[PDB]
Design a protein around this nucleic acid. Structure first.
Ligand code: DTP
Ligand code: CA
Ligand code: CA
Length: 341
DNA sequence: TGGAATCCTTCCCCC
DNA sequence: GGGGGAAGGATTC
């Protein structure tokens, strides 16, 4: 099996660059302004000229501004990047039918049939990078290996504007060599839990009683890691299905007054129902980010779909449960819909 | 900030 | 005991 993975370089900033080419060469910061004070919000992403000074996804816009007061700061336009995304995904379909769209900027391809080895794959690699650059003026990084996980690791190593092959000899090398934190699916919380068990490299996973692993990081993530370390990971490329739709918004001020929270909640419902587009959910969840940035949710599944009218009334009940059961103020409020007919 | 998948624990109903 | 589904969270990208 041969998997080819594509990650679109600094994606939101690059689209902004493409749509306004004068940006190129400058540091560009795509921001999610939250509207509480001037420059409240976070950075969605930044191009490389900004990242090399620490300006990156996650940091507050006020912090980015302190480091690069003269960078170019743009509000995020998700819809635009999304439409550009779709176009690029279409290009890749013309290279394989088996395609796993992982994110707005990530896709895996099963090119087992279309190619014979890591020479030919490298070429198809370049064919694709070039086609996407030609048709869309967008640079991407390509990772190629024996399974998804490694395909992605290859890309991470080779970015930006790279293309990289992790063969079999390297796979075996990285199983011993690679820091387990750099393995997809392993965040700060799992990486620290693995340190406490002495797992610092993928191979260490074999020096443990399976139940102690399951006991710590959970069963599924334990099997994941073990199969990887055993050169045995082999999950297939599959169409991912939209299972949930929603939208959460930031309120100007933290609050506990019901009538103060409702309009944000209603706006959240509205945007969500538009996004549904002929989809009909039987589940609603009201989600709230408390003032200490903790996340509380109350929900309900119906035996039928939910009309906009029903969602309005039910969301207020769930919002009321939340207030009744959590004493903190609400920072962010919103909804998810799920269990589509 | 923020969308959404996947997972995990718990509770519950009931053969 | 365990299938089976909900609910509320935890974790990740
Ligand atoms: N923490 C975040 N907050 C908001 N949006 C994000 C965040 N991280 C990523 N995104 C968005 C914007 C990104 O361009 C896009 C893809 O993320 P990602 O693949 O990790 O990096 P990137 O596209 O910005 O470039 P690169 O992979 O070269 O670092 O999704
Ligand atoms: Ca990318
Ligand atoms: Ca990591």
């Amino acid at each position: 099996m041969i998997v080819l993975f594509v990650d679109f370089d600094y994606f939101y900033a690059q689209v902004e660059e493409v749509l306004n080419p004068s940006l190129k060469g400058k540091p560009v910061v795509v921001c999610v302004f939250s509207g509480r004070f001037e420059d409240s919000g976070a950075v969605a992403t930044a191009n490389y000229e900004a990242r090399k000074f620490g300006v990156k996804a996650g940091i507050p816009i006020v912090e980015a501004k302190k480091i690069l007061p003269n960078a170019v700061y743009l509000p995020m336009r998700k819809e635009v990047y999304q439409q550009v995304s779709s176009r690029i995904m279409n290009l890749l379909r013309e290279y394989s039918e088996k395609i796993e769209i992982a994110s707005i900027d990530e896709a895996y391809l099963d090119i087992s049939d279309k190619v014979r080895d890591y020479r030919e794959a490298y070429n198809l690699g370049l064919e694709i990078k070039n086609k996407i650059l030609e048709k869309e003026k967008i640079t991407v990084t390509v990772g190629i290996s024996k399974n998804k996980v490694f395909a992605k690791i290859a890309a991470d190593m080779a970015k930006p504007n790279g293309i990289k092959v992790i063969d079999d000899e390297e796979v075996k090398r990285l199983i011993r060599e690679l820091d387990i934190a750099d393995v997809p699916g392993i965040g700060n919380i799992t990486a620290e839990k693995l340190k406490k068990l002495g797992i610092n490299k993928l191979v260490d996973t074999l020096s443990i009683e399976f139940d102690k692993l399951k006991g710590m990081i959970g069963e599924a993530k334990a099997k994941y890691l073990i199969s990887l370390a055993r050169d045995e990971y082999n999950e297939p490329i599959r169409t991912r299905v939209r299972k949930s739709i929603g939208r959460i918004v930031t309120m100007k001020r933290n609050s506990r007054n019901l009538e103060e929270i409702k309009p944000y909640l209603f706006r959240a419902i509205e945007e969500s129902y538009y996004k549904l587009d002929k989809r009909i959910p039987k589940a609603i969840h009201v989600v709230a980010v408390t003032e200490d940035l903790d996340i509380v949710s109350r929900g309900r599944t119906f035996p039928h779909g939910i009309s906009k009218e029903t969602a309005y009334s039910e969301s207020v009940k769930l919002l009321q449960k939340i207030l009744e059961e959590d004493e903190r103020k609400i920072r962010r409020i919103g909804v998810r819909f799920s269990k589509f007919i």
